[model samples]
Target: TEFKAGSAKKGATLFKTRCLQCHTVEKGGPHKVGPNLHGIFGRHSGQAEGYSYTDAAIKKNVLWDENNMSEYLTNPKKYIPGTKMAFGGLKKEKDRNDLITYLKKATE
Candidate 1:
Protein backbone atom coordinates (compact mmCIF):
# COMPACT_ATOMS: atom_id res chain seq x y z
CA THR A 1 0.00 0.00 0.00
CA GLU A 2 2.86 2.33 -0.71
CA PHE A 3 1.91 5.67 -2.18
CA LYS A 4 3.68 7.11 -5.20
CA ALA A 5 6.95 8.58 -4.04
CA GLY A 6 6.83 11.56 -6.35
CA SER A 7 3.75 13.08 -4.77
CA ALA A 8 4.83 12.17 -1.27
CA LYS A 9 8.18 13.81 -1.75
CA LYS A 10 6.54 16.94 -3.04
CA GLY A 11 4.29 16.87 -0.02
CA ALA A 12 7.27 16.44 2.32
CA THR A 13 8.86 19.58 0.96
CA LEU A 14 5.59 21.44 1.17
CA PHE A 15 4.86 20.18 4.68
CA LYS A 16 8.26 21.02 6.07
CA THR A 17 8.13 24.46 4.53
CA ARG A 18 4.51 25.13 5.38
CA CYS A 19 3.01 22.71 7.92
CA LEU A 20 5.92 21.62 10.20
CA GLN A 21 6.21 24.99 11.82
CA CYS A 22 2.85 24.59 13.53
CA HIS A 23 2.19 20.85 13.53
CA THR A 24 4.15 17.83 14.70
CA VAL A 25 3.32 14.67 12.79
CA GLU A 26 5.59 12.43 14.76
CA LYS A 27 5.43 11.61 18.49
CA GLY A 28 6.93 15.03 19.25
CA GLY A 29 8.23 17.89 17.18
CA PRO A 30 6.57 21.04 18.36
CA HIS A 31 2.97 22.04 18.83
CA LYS A 32 2.88 25.67 17.90
CA VAL A 33 -0.50 27.10 16.90
CA GLY A 34 -2.07 23.68 16.21
CA PRO A 35 -2.12 20.21 17.64
CA ASN A 36 0.10 17.26 16.76
CA LEU A 37 -1.15 15.77 13.49
CA HIS A 38 0.26 12.31 14.02
CA GLY A 39 -2.94 10.44 13.32
CA ILE A 40 -5.17 13.05 11.75
CA PHE A 41 -6.71 11.27 8.78
CA GLY A 42 -9.48 8.81 9.57
CA ARG A 43 -9.57 10.40 13.01
CA HIS A 44 -12.57 12.18 14.45
CA SER A 45 -12.53 15.85 13.65
CA GLY A 46 -11.71 18.30 16.43
CA GLN A 47 -10.54 15.50 18.70
CA ALA A 48 -6.96 16.55 19.20
CA GLU A 49 -5.51 16.52 22.69
CA GLY A 50 -4.95 19.54 24.91
CA TYR A 51 -6.69 21.97 22.58
CA SER A 52 -10.21 23.16 23.23
CA TYR A 53 -12.03 22.58 19.98
CA THR A 54 -14.86 24.90 19.20
CA ASP A 55 -18.35 23.57 18.71
CA ALA A 56 -18.74 25.44 15.45
CA ALA A 57 -18.15 22.36 13.33
CA ILE A 58 -19.47 19.76 15.73
CA LYS A 59 -22.90 19.45 14.14
CA LYS A 60 -21.51 16.74 11.88
CA ASN A 61 -19.12 14.03 12.95
CA VAL A 62 -16.51 14.87 10.37
CA LEU A 63 -14.05 12.20 9.29
CA TRP A 64 -10.78 13.03 7.64
CA ASP A 65 -10.25 11.26 4.36
CA GLU A 66 -9.08 12.25 0.88
CA ASN A 67 -12.32 14.02 0.14
CA ASN A 68 -12.54 15.69 3.49
CA MET A 69 -8.95 16.83 3.33
CA SER A 70 -9.45 18.13 -0.17
CA GLU A 71 -12.35 20.28 0.88
CA TYR A 72 -10.58 21.50 3.96
CA LEU A 73 -7.44 22.30 2.06
CA THR A 74 -9.42 24.23 -0.45
CA ASN A 75 -11.00 26.39 2.17
CA PRO A 76 -10.41 25.97 5.87
CA LYS A 77 -12.81 28.65 7.01
CA LYS A 78 -15.60 27.27 4.89
CA TYR A 79 -15.06 23.78 6.24
CA ILE A 80 -14.53 24.79 9.86
CA PRO A 81 -15.59 28.27 10.69
CA GLY A 82 -13.94 28.33 14.08
CA THR A 83 -10.73 26.67 12.98
CA LYS A 84 -7.70 28.59 14.13
CA MET A 85 -5.59 27.56 11.18
CA ALA A 86 -4.04 30.76 9.91
CA PHE A 87 -2.74 29.48 6.64
CA GLY A 88 -5.12 30.16 3.78
CA GLY A 89 -4.73 26.53 2.64
CA LEU A 90 -3.25 25.06 -0.54
CA LYS A 91 -5.70 25.70 -3.33
CA LYS A 92 -4.00 23.55 -5.93
CA GLU A 93 -5.39 20.07 -6.32
CA LYS A 94 -2.01 18.45 -6.79
CA ASP A 95 -0.66 20.15 -3.72
CA ARG A 96 -3.55 18.96 -1.63
CA ASN A 97 -3.20 15.45 -2.99
CA ASP A 98 0.49 15.48 -2.24
CA LEU A 99 -0.11 16.63 1.30
CA ILE A 100 -2.72 13.97 1.96
CA THR A 101 -0.38 11.31 0.59
CA TYR A 102 2.41 12.47 2.85
CA LEU A 103 0.21 12.40 5.91
CA LYS A 104 -1.16 8.98 5.11
CA LYS A 105 2.32 7.56 4.61
CA ALA A 106 3.60 9.05 7.84
CA THR A 107 0.66 7.90 9.96
CA GLU A 108 0.80 4.40 8.56
Candidate 2:
Protein backbone atom coordinates (compact mmCIF):
# COMPACT_ATOMS: atom_id res chain seq x y z
CA THR A 1 0.00 0.00 0.00
CA GLU A 2 1.09 3.56 -0.64
CA PHE A 3 2.17 5.25 2.54
CA LYS A 4 0.61 8.41 3.93
CA ALA A 5 1.47 11.55 2.08
CA GLY A 6 3.87 13.73 4.04
CA SER A 7 6.66 16.17 3.43
CA ALA A 8 9.67 13.95 3.81
CA LYS A 9 11.77 16.85 2.70
CA LYS A 10 10.67 18.76 5.76
CA GLY A 11 11.21 15.70 7.88
CA ALA A 12 14.80 15.49 6.69
CA THR A 13 15.29 19.03 7.81
CA LEU A 14 13.70 18.23 11.13
CA PHE A 15 16.08 15.34 11.60
CA LYS A 16 19.04 17.51 10.83
CA THR A 17 17.95 20.15 13.28
CA ARG A 18 16.27 18.15 16.02
CA CYS A 19 17.35 14.51 15.77
CA LEU A 20 20.89 14.63 14.36
CA GLN A 21 22.26 15.14 17.82
CA CYS A 22 22.04 11.40 18.46
CA HIS A 23 20.71 9.51 15.44
CA THR A 24 21.80 8.94 11.90
CA VAL A 25 19.62 7.44 9.16
CA GLU A 26 21.94 6.46 6.33
CA LYS A 27 22.30 2.73 5.84
CA GLY A 28 25.25 1.35 7.80
CA GLY A 29 25.44 4.57 9.80
CA PRO A 30 27.01 4.45 13.20
CA HIS A 31 25.04 3.82 16.34
CA LYS A 32 25.69 7.05 18.11
CA VAL A 33 24.44 7.75 21.60
CA GLY A 34 21.26 6.42 19.98
CA PRO A 35 20.91 3.44 17.71
CA ASN A 36 21.39 4.13 14.05
CA LEU A 37 17.79 4.36 12.86
CA HIS A 38 18.45 2.71 9.53
CA GLY A 39 15.76 0.26 8.53
CA ILE A 40 13.69 0.93 11.65
CA PHE A 41 10.28 0.28 10.14
CA GLY A 42 10.06 -3.45 10.87
CA ARG A 43 12.88 -3.91 13.37
CA HIS A 44 12.32 -5.20 16.87
CA SER A 45 13.37 -3.53 20.09
CA GLY A 46 16.79 -4.07 21.62
CA GLN A 47 18.02 -5.95 18.56
CA ALA A 48 20.94 -3.75 17.70
CA GLU A 49 24.16 -5.50 18.60
CA GLY A 50 26.59 -3.71 20.89
CA TYR A 51 23.90 -1.28 21.99
CA SER A 52 22.95 -1.85 25.57
CA TYR A 53 19.23 -2.09 26.14
CA THR A 54 17.36 -1.54 29.35
CA ASP A 55 15.53 -4.47 30.90
CA ALA A 56 12.16 -3.01 30.08
CA ALA A 57 13.11 -2.41 26.46
CA ILE A 58 14.45 -5.91 26.04
CA LYS A 59 11.46 -7.38 27.78
CA LYS A 60 8.98 -5.55 25.56
CA ASN A 61 10.83 -6.14 22.27
CA VAL A 62 7.91 -4.91 20.20
CA LEU A 63 8.23 -4.63 16.45
CA TRP A 64 8.07 -1.07 15.07
CA ASP A 65 5.52 -0.09 12.47
CA GLU A 66 3.93 3.14 11.28
CA ASN A 67 1.38 3.28 14.06
CA ASN A 68 3.75 2.26 16.83
CA MET A 69 6.40 4.59 15.57
CA SER A 70 3.97 7.48 15.77
CA GLU A 71 2.89 6.40 19.20
CA TYR A 72 6.43 6.02 20.42
CA LEU A 73 7.38 9.38 19.07
CA THR A 74 4.53 10.88 20.99
CA ASN A 75 6.12 9.77 24.23
CA PRO A 76 9.37 7.88 24.36
CA LYS A 77 9.60 7.33 28.10
CA LYS A 78 5.93 6.51 28.24
CA TYR A 79 5.95 4.06 25.32
CA ILE A 80 8.99 2.11 26.47
CA PRO A 81 9.87 2.78 30.01
CA GLY A 82 13.63 2.97 30.42
CA THR A 83 14.21 3.73 26.77
CA LYS A 84 17.37 5.75 26.20
CA MET A 85 15.65 7.85 23.57
CA ALA A 86 15.81 11.35 25.03
CA PHE A 87 13.85 14.07 23.26
CA GLY A 88 10.55 15.77 23.02
CA GLY A 89 8.26 13.72 20.79
CA LEU A 90 6.64 14.79 17.58
CA LYS A 91 3.37 15.73 19.15
CA LYS A 92 2.04 17.49 16.10
CA GLU A 93 0.33 15.15 13.67
CA LYS A 94 1.71 16.98 10.67
CA ASP A 95 5.19 16.78 12.08
CA ARG A 96 4.93 13.05 12.67
CA ASN A 97 3.57 12.59 9.20
CA ASP A 98 6.50 14.48 7.78
CA LEU A 99 9.08 12.66 9.84
CA ILE A 100 7.55 9.27 9.19
CA THR A 101 7.62 10.02 5.51
CA TYR A 102 11.25 10.91 5.74
CA LEU A 103 12.04 7.77 7.68
CA LYS A 104 10.26 5.51 5.19
CA LYS A 105 11.99 7.13 2.29
CA ALA A 106 15.44 7.56 3.76
CA THR A 107 15.73 4.15 5.35
CA GLU A 108 15.18 2.46 2.05
Candidate 3:
Protein backbone atom coordinates (compact mmCIF):
# COMPACT_ATOMS: atom_id res chain seq x y z
CA THR A 1 0.00 0.00 0.00
CA GLU A 2 2.40 2.61 -1.24
CA PHE A 3 0.26 5.71 -0.98
CA LYS A 4 3.31 7.82 -1.70
CA ALA A 5 2.65 7.77 -5.42
CA GLY A 6 -1.04 8.65 -5.29
CA SER A 7 -2.36 11.82 -6.95
CA ALA A 8 -3.31 14.68 -4.69
CA LYS A 9 -5.64 16.23 -7.25
CA LYS A 10 -7.59 13.03 -7.55
CA GLY A 11 -7.49 12.58 -3.83
CA ALA A 12 -8.91 16.05 -3.20
CA THR A 13 -11.76 15.33 -5.54
CA LEU A 14 -12.57 12.11 -3.76
CA PHE A 15 -12.41 13.91 -0.44
CA LYS A 16 -14.97 16.45 -1.59
CA THR A 17 -17.79 13.94 -1.44
CA ARG A 18 -16.47 11.49 1.11
CA CYS A 19 -14.82 13.60 3.81
CA LEU A 20 -15.04 17.40 3.44
CA GLN A 21 -18.50 17.82 4.95
CA CYS A 22 -17.45 16.06 8.12
CA HIS A 23 -13.77 16.97 8.42
CA THR A 24 -11.44 19.91 8.24
CA VAL A 25 -8.01 19.30 6.75
CA GLU A 26 -6.20 22.48 7.66
CA LYS A 27 -3.79 23.09 10.51
CA GLY A 28 -5.49 24.64 13.56
CA GLY A 29 -8.83 24.05 11.91
CA PRO A 30 -11.84 23.53 14.11
CA HIS A 31 -13.71 20.26 14.38
CA LYS A 32 -16.86 19.91 12.33
CA VAL A 33 -19.05 16.79 12.27
CA GLY A 34 -15.80 15.00 13.01
CA PRO A 35 -12.51 16.27 14.41
CA ASN A 36 -10.04 18.45 12.61
CA LEU A 37 -7.64 16.28 10.62
CA HIS A 38 -4.60 18.49 10.98
CA GLY A 39 -1.44 16.41 11.07
CA ILE A 40 -3.18 13.04 11.04
CA PHE A 41 -0.39 10.82 9.81
CA GLY A 42 1.95 9.36 12.42
CA ARG A 43 -0.42 10.30 15.24
CA HIS A 44 -2.23 7.77 17.37
CA SER A 45 -5.98 7.22 17.19
CA GLY A 46 -8.14 9.22 19.62
CA GLN A 47 -5.32 11.70 20.29
CA ALA A 48 -6.80 14.89 18.96
CA GLU A 49 -6.65 17.82 21.36
CA GLY A 50 -10.30 18.88 21.38
CA TYR A 51 -12.33 15.99 20.07
CA SER A 52 -14.17 13.26 21.92
CA TYR A 53 -13.40 9.95 20.35
CA THR A 54 -15.16 6.74 21.22
CA ASP A 55 -13.83 4.27 23.80
CA ALA A 56 -13.04 1.92 20.98
CA ALA A 57 -10.91 4.54 19.22
CA ILE A 58 -9.11 5.67 22.36
CA LYS A 59 -8.43 2.11 23.37
CA LYS A 60 -7.17 1.02 19.98
CA ASN A 61 -4.34 3.58 20.35
CA VAL A 62 -2.57 2.60 17.18
CA LEU A 63 -0.28 4.80 15.11
CA TRP A 64 -1.58 6.22 11.84
CA ASP A 65 0.41 4.71 9.05
CA GLU A 66 -0.38 3.74 5.49
CA ASN A 67 -1.20 0.09 6.11
CA ASN A 68 -3.63 0.71 8.96
CA MET A 69 -5.09 3.75 7.24
CA SER A 70 -5.85 1.70 4.18
CA GLU A 71 -7.49 -1.05 6.17
CA TYR A 72 -9.52 1.37 8.25
CA LEU A 73 -10.82 3.27 5.26
CA THR A 74 -11.61 0.07 3.41
CA ASN A 75 -13.95 -0.91 6.22
CA PRO A 76 -14.23 1.42 9.22
CA LYS A 77 -16.32 -0.93 11.36
CA LYS A 78 -14.12 -3.90 10.60
CA TYR A 79 -11.04 -1.94 11.66
CA ILE A 80 -12.49 -0.10 14.62
CA PRO A 81 -15.72 -1.46 15.92
CA GLY A 82 -18.17 0.66 17.92
CA THR A 83 -16.96 3.82 16.23
CA LYS A 84 -19.45 6.70 16.00
CA MET A 85 -18.35 7.67 12.52
CA ALA A 86 -21.17 7.35 10.04
CA PHE A 87 -19.01 6.32 7.15
CA GLY A 88 -19.84 2.85 5.86
CA GLY A 89 -16.46 2.50 4.11
CA LEU A 90 -14.50 3.67 1.11
CA LYS A 91 -14.45 0.18 -0.46
CA LYS A 92 -12.50 1.32 -3.49
CA GLU A 93 -8.77 0.88 -3.24
CA LYS A 94 -7.97 3.73 -5.59
CA ASP A 95 -10.14 6.16 -3.65
CA ARG A 96 -8.49 5.23 -0.40
CA ASN A 97 -5.08 5.45 -2.01
CA ASP A 98 -5.79 8.88 -3.42
CA LEU A 99 -7.33 10.27 -0.21
CA ILE A 100 -4.29 9.27 1.80
CA THR A 101 -2.16 11.15 -0.65
CA TYR A 102 -4.26 14.30 -0.26
CA LEU A 103 -4.64 14.01 3.48
CA LYS A 104 -0.90 13.74 4.02
CA LYS A 105 -0.30 17.13 2.48
CA ALA A 106 -3.50 19.00 3.36
CA THR A 107 -3.42 18.12 7.03
CA GLU A 108 0.16 19.20 7.39
Candidate 4:
Protein backbone atom coordinates (compact mmCIF):
# COMPACT_ATOMS: atom_id res chain seq x y z
CA THR A 1 0.00 0.00 0.00
CA GLU A 2 1.07 3.55 -0.70
CA PHE A 3 1.95 5.71 2.26
CA LYS A 4 -0.73 8.19 3.24
CA ALA A 5 0.33 11.61 4.47
CA GLY A 6 -2.97 12.79 5.85
CA SER A 7 -3.17 9.91 8.26
CA ALA A 8 -0.49 11.67 10.26
CA LYS A 9 -3.00 14.35 11.16
CA LYS A 10 -5.29 11.77 12.73
CA GLY A 11 -2.28 10.30 14.46
CA ALA A 12 -1.38 13.69 15.80
CA THR A 13 -4.80 14.03 17.38
CA LEU A 14 -4.53 10.62 18.90
CA PHE A 15 -1.14 11.56 20.26
CA LYS A 16 -2.46 14.75 21.79
CA THR A 17 -5.11 12.79 23.61
CA ARG A 18 -3.09 9.78 24.64
CA CYS A 19 0.57 10.79 24.55
CA LEU A 20 1.04 14.51 25.03
CA GLN A 21 1.46 14.31 28.77
CA CYS A 22 4.56 12.17 28.49
CA HIS A 23 6.01 12.93 25.11
CA THR A 24 6.72 15.85 22.86
CA VAL A 25 7.60 16.15 19.19
CA GLU A 26 8.27 19.85 19.05
CA LYS A 27 11.50 21.32 20.37
CA GLY A 28 11.58 22.18 24.09
CA GLY A 29 8.38 20.51 25.20
CA PRO A 30 8.40 19.10 28.70
CA HIS A 31 9.35 15.53 29.35
CA LYS A 32 6.81 14.96 32.07
CA VAL A 33 6.95 11.19 32.29
CA GLY A 34 9.03 10.39 29.23
CA PRO A 35 11.52 12.03 26.95
CA ASN A 36 10.72 14.36 24.12
CA LEU A 37 9.89 12.47 20.95
CA HIS A 38 11.35 15.12 18.72
CA GLY A 39 13.36 13.37 15.99
CA ILE A 40 12.60 10.01 17.52
CA PHE A 41 11.84 8.06 14.33
CA GLY A 42 15.38 7.78 13.07
CA ARG A 43 16.95 8.40 16.46
CA HIS A 44 18.81 5.74 18.33
CA SER A 45 16.79 4.22 21.11
CA GLY A 46 17.33 5.76 24.54
CA GLN A 47 19.30 8.63 23.03
CA ALA A 48 16.94 11.55 23.18
CA GLU A 49 18.63 14.71 24.41
CA GLY A 50 18.67 15.47 28.12
CA TYR A 51 16.68 12.46 29.16
CA SER A 52 17.70 9.56 31.32
CA TYR A 53 16.71 6.32 29.63
CA THR A 54 16.64 2.98 31.35
CA ASP A 55 19.58 0.62 30.96
CA ALA A 56 17.59 -1.92 28.98
CA ALA A 57 16.63 0.62 26.38
CA ILE A 58 20.21 1.85 26.22
CA LYS A 59 21.79 -1.56 25.89
CA LYS A 60 19.56 -2.49 22.97
CA ASN A 61 21.33 0.06 20.75
CA VAL A 62 18.46 -0.03 18.32
CA LEU A 63 17.35 2.78 16.09
CA TRP A 64 13.69 3.69 15.85
CA ASP A 65 12.63 2.31 12.50
CA GLU A 66 9.24 1.35 11.17
CA ASN A 67 9.39 -2.26 12.27
CA ASN A 68 10.78 -1.56 15.72
CA MET A 69 8.22 1.16 16.19
CA SER A 70 5.36 -1.11 15.11
CA GLU A 71 6.40 -3.70 17.63
CA TYR A 72 7.00 -1.15 20.35
CA LEU A 73 3.63 0.50 19.83
CA THR A 74 1.89 -2.84 20.08
CA ASN A 75 3.49 -3.44 23.45
CA PRO A 76 5.89 -1.09 25.14
CA LYS A 77 6.68 -3.38 28.04
CA LYS A 78 7.39 -6.31 25.77
CA TYR A 79 9.59 -4.19 23.57
CA ILE A 80 11.61 -2.87 26.48
CA PRO A 81 11.59 -4.69 29.74
CA GLY A 82 12.06 -1.60 31.88
CA THR A 83 10.82 1.22 29.71
CA LYS A 84 9.26 3.96 31.80
CA MET A 85 6.31 4.49 29.47
CA ALA A 86 3.09 3.33 31.02
CA PHE A 87 1.16 3.15 27.77
CA GLY A 88 -0.94 -0.02 27.76
CA GLY A 89 -0.32 0.20 24.07
CA LEU A 90 -2.21 1.03 20.89
CA LYS A 91 -3.90 -2.32 20.31
CA LYS A 92 -5.37 -1.52 16.91
CA GLU A 93 -2.97 -2.04 14.04
CA LYS A 94 -4.34 0.91 12.11
CA ASP A 95 -3.75 3.26 15.01
CA ARG A 96 -0.18 2.06 15.35
CA ASN A 97 0.28 2.47 11.63
CA ASP A 98 -1.02 6.01 11.67
CA LEU A 99 0.92 6.87 14.80
CA ILE A 100 4.14 5.65 13.26
CA THR A 101 3.35 7.61 10.13
CA TYR A 102 2.82 10.68 12.25
CA LEU A 103 6.05 10.10 14.13
CA LYS A 104 7.98 9.86 10.91
CA LYS A 105 6.54 13.11 9.60
CA ALA A 106 6.92 14.98 12.85
CA THR A 107 10.52 14.01 13.34
CA GLU A 108 11.47 14.83 9.80
Task: For residue 102, give model 1's deviation from the true position in Å.
Answer: 0.5
| Model 1, span 1-108: residue lDDT tens | 322333888888889998887877886545567778877788877777676666765544689776787788888878888767777988777788888888888865
Sort by lDDT, best first: what order? 3, 2, 4, 1
**In candidate 1, residue 35 scores what lDDT?**
76
Candidate 3: deviation at residue 73, Å? 0.3
**Model 3 root-mean-square deviation:** 1.3
Give the clashing residue pairs of candidate 1, or none: none
Per-residue lDDT of 59 in model 3? 88
Full-model lDDT for every candidate: 0.76, 0.83, 0.85, 0.80
- Top model by TM-score, which number? 3
Residue runs of model 2 more than 4 Å from their true location after superposition: 1-3
Q: Put down candidate 4 lDDT per residue, 1-108, tens digits, no spaces.
A: 533333888888888888887877786766668888877766788887678888988987778887788788889889888877788998888888788788888867
Worst 10 residues of 3 by lDDT: 1-10
Better of 1 and 2 by TM-score: 2
Backbone clashes in model 3, listed as residue pairs: none
- Model 1 regions more than 4 Å off: 1-6, 28-30, 57-60
* lDDT score, candidate 4, position 74: 87
Give the 10-residue window scoring lowest on summed lDDT in candidate 2.
1-10
Query: What are the TM-scores, per candidate, against the unseen true structure?
Result: 0.83, 0.90, 0.93, 0.87
Error of 2 at 64 (Å): 1.0
